[PDB]
Write a protein that binds this ligand. Structure first.
Ligand SMILES: Nc1ncnc2c1ncn2[C@@H]1O[C@H](COP(=O)(O)OP(=O)(O)O)[C@@H](O)[C@H]1O
Ligand SMILES: Nc1ncnc2c1ncn2[C@@H]1O[C@H](COP(=O)(O)OP(=O)(O)O)[C@@H](O)[C@H]1O
Ligand SMILES: NCc1ccc(-c2ccccc2F)c(Cl)c1
Ligand SMILES: [Cl-]
Ligand SMILES: [Mg+2]
Ligand SMILES: [Mg+2]
Lengths: 323, 324
């Protein structure tokens, strides 16, 4: 396959010392979990149990993410990235790293976010709200990208919104990775619906632009009221769902531009598809959220070619954000 | 001790929401320092390293104050105050808040001021320039006081003057605090020479008037060409230097009015001193900067009783500023 590199923040990690990006050598100091009293279960993830808790030293509400010890490399990577981004705009704040004395189970302590339900937000979100929150996500992404980090799991469940306070936080940095130009990465990242064409075709030399595809999927789902927007039933079917909207023409142009070898399992399912017009998705139920600005912006995010997608900083200058 | 409150802007913070003054709960969003290239060291403070820098996105000169991390409460307090005062007249502008990706050291980014040397300014200032710059400082103080903030470190080193452009900025908001009536504050603030009598006698219920005393010290040092004007060698000696000018009689009236208890360490050093006439500091080298209006104005700033000092807004109406 043809090599590729990010169009922005290409060499930010190459120009930094090993200690910034080498998480395998990073020393993690695990505090005592006795300083935290667990209150109630908030959620349950892939390899974690999330609780609301009270810091008994200052009477402050926190969130404790108890981790199921999978590769220690993965835990170290999540801690290092959270420490590098600590304080960044709309990035969840890692407040502490603790271990329970008896269980020895790792636990990450975060600032508490009073999260508004996805279904509840879906019904009450106006055109202005979508522009406002989309801008807040772009701040978090331009920041973590400037810090040489790819989130690689952008989706509505990894975006905490406290609608009352108009507070947004990008969470779940468990799949995040340091961008090194020319590096070949694992393509089994992101959630199915938000996976970029680059991951589905097994093109390993991807970058920050992966996050811009996932963000495009979120925007299309919100303005068109169709969640998820690309509803694959598996990873191969996921590419077919995309192909049914952006066509097999641009798809073959993309695979030819980067000299990508398609898996044989794609022959009997891919077929031939024309490129759709973003206007067909407009209906009576979503017309109040759609605008020529929103369609032009979406068109510039949902592109097969990862190099042709808007960067987070370019996306922030788009006329769609005149608010 | 007898309670005291400011005569101006007394309740401005009590009538505001907690968001304005609760700095401990304020959320700080730390940008990326990669947008700034450091050029040279400009100064080094008690807990900061100050650099001239270039914003590489617009090729603009800025100042980057690298903070030696003391209590994070103090950094949060300085950021919140700078954000509340951002845009105010003659207040340094906080342009950005950033952290170095590797070091994770907090840094504040300010507008650049091309500061004229204290010694160079001291040699070239005329009666007019002093009245002019004194007025510019009063705008910054009346403004921050109206915003419920006490600077608490007013001195010539915290006042940037670009004499070529007649540009003045009040900097270093690291000791600044929100005024809450009846609150007892830490008296270990301001620089020795500029400490008001209220701090030296350990009277904790002070206000904005502290800033007016420090401004009076700056005015006396400029018009009389004696820097510092009250040259203490320690905090107790600092009160003795003041008493040698204002006299011990008004000092005892001040502590009696507020029922303050003097520290026993003041007994063998304070002595007895008469109040000196301000005209006694006039000499051949400073008479071109002295006038009856300047002496009357100074007399109304350099008062033991913090309540009897002119407020910044009253100070602006004084005949000393007829020229401006
Ligand atoms: N800061 C937070 N405030 C409130 N709830 C949170 C916070 N962080 C995580 N959660 C909750 O925990 C769930 C899972 O957390 P997450 O970090 O995404 O881990 P996982 O990768 O195991 O799913 C989220 O969907 C959310 O409901
Ligand atoms: N905006 C500025 N422009 C130019 N010089 C400045 C500016 N801000 C600070 N400095 C320089 O840096 C020095 C120290 O800055 P300061 O804010 O007073 O920090 P500290 O609280 O640590 O003493 C100043 O005395 C001055 O020489
Ligand atoms: N940066 C050194 C400096 C030098 C002189 C002054 C000054 C000017 C006019 C009146 C009173 C003054 F003390 C100031 Cl504010 C600062
Ligand atoms: Cl009173
Ligand atoms: Mg200073
Ligand atoms: Mg400063």
């Amino acid at each position: 396959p043809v090599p590729s590199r990010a169009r922005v923040y290409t060499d930010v990690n190459t120009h930094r010392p090993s200690e910034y990006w080498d998480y395998e050598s990073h020393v993690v100091e695990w505090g005592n979990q006795d300083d935290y009293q667990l209150v109630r279960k908030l959620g349950r993830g892939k390899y974690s149990e999330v609780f609301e808790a009270i810091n008994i030293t200052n009477n402050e509400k926190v969130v404790v993410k108890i981790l199921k010890p999978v590769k220690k490399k993965k835990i170290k990577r999540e801690i290092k990235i959270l420490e590098n981004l600590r304080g960044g705009p709309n990035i969840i704040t890692l407040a502490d790293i603790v271990k329970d004395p008896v269980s020895r189970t790792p636990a990450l302590v975060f600032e508490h976010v009073n999260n508004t339900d996805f279904k509840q937000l879906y019904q009450t979100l106006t055109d202005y709200d979508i522009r406002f929150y989309m801008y807040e996500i772009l701040k978090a992404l331009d920041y973590c990208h400037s810090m040489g980090i790819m989130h690689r799991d952008v989706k509505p469940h990894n975006v905490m919104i406290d609608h009352e306070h108009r507070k947004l936080r990008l969470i779940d940095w468990g799949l995040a990775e340091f961008y090194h130009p020319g590096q070949e990465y694992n393509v089994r990242v992101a959630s199915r619906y938000f996976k970029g064409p680059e991951l589905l075709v097994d093109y390993q030399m991807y970058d920050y632009s992966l996050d811009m595809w996932s963000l495009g999927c979120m925007l299309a789902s919100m303005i068109f009221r169709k969640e998820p927007f690309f509803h694959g039933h598996d990873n191969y079917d996921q590419l077919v769902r995309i192909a049914k909207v952006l066509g097999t023409e641009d798809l073959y142009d993309y695979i030819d531009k980067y000299n990508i070898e398609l898996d044989p399992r794609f022959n009997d399912i891919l077929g031939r598809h024309s490129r759709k017009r973003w206007e067909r998705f407009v209906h009576s139920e979503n017309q109040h959220l759609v605008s020529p600005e929103a369609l032009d912006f979406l068109d510039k995010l949902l592109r097969y070619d990862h190099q042709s997608r808007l960067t987070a900083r370019e996306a922030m200058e788009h006329p769609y954000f005149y608010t």
